[PDB]
Amino acid sequence: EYPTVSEIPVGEVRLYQIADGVWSHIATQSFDGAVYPSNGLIVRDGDELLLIDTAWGAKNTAALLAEIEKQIGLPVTRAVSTHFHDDRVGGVDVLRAAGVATYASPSTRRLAEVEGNEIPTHSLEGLSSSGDAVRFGPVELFYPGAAHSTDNLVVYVPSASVLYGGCAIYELSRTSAGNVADADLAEWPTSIERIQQHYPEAQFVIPGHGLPGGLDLLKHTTNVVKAHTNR
Numbered sequence: 001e002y003p004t005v006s007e008i009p010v011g012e013v014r015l016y017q018i019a020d021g022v023w024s025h026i027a028t029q030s031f032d033g034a035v036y037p038s039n040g041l042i043v044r045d046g047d048e049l050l051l052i053d054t055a056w057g058a059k060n061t062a063a064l065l066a067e068i069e070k071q072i073g074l075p076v077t078r079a080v081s082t083h084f085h086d087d088r089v090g091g092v093d094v095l096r097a098a099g100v101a102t103y104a105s106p107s108t109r110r111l112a113e114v115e116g117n118e119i120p121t122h123s124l125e126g127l128s129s130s131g132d133a134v135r136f137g138p139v140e141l142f143y144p145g146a147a148h149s150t151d152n153l154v155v156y157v158p159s160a161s162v163l164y165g166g167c168a169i170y171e172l173s174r175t176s177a178g179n180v181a182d183a184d185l186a187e188w189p190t191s192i193e194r195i196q197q198h199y200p201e202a203q204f205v206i207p208g209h210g211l212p213g214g215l216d217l218l219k220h221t222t223n224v225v226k227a228h229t230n231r
């Protein structure tokens, strides 16, 4: 039942409920002649919603809001981008125009600015050092160290035992390293150890792209990252 690229036309977005008040959002983008899905997270916070990541572009992110409005009916008041790449900040200006307060770490904001990508408005303090955690309404935010990018955050929903690894965690079907141009391959496995060591209790692990699993996805990512390092 977890939505795949076969069910989703580029431009559309599917929500998938994972627990009481916890959803993933799924969108697709056309990249290098292939079609690839992407995951973000939606977490209920009283009578409002926190959004983790854009749906990878302005048009998808407009559809994401329309899909949230239709299917959940609570307002998105805050959004957090988990690193500076386009699949996480692309659509921030859409969010901002709809009244969403947009957030990222200063590291992410600076890299976004340097990259010419969209820049979330608000700064998340207290995440500058590997192993830092901060609370953010109904989630904890964790900086595990450099991995997929130097700024990548992971998000844990203490109340549903949901860990959203964003692009620092790979799905099981992904057996070769993705876009590593901005990655710290030397530190990635240590960063994942930090995630393992902080969230030993997670039950649902959502990778940046593709199918959820359990904690095995962390070891899976490590294996793939090491294989790539030994190419």
Ligand SMILES: O=C(O)c1ncsc1NS(=O)(=O)c1cccnc1
Pocket: 031, 032, 034, 035, 036, 087, 148, 167, 177, 178, 179, 180, 208
């Ligand atoms: O690995 C990532 O997080 C990532 N995010 C957007 S694209 C990408 N990796 S990728 O460019 O190597 C990719 C994988 C599969 C199909 N097309 C592109």
Ligand SMILES: [Zn+2]
Pocket: 083, 085, 148, 149, 167
């Ligand atoms: Zn990325």
Ligand SMILES: [Zn+2]
Pocket: 101, 102, 121, 122
């Ligand atoms: Zn504001």
Ligand SMILES: [Zn+2]
Pocket: 087, 167, 208, 209
């Ligand atoms: Zn990605």
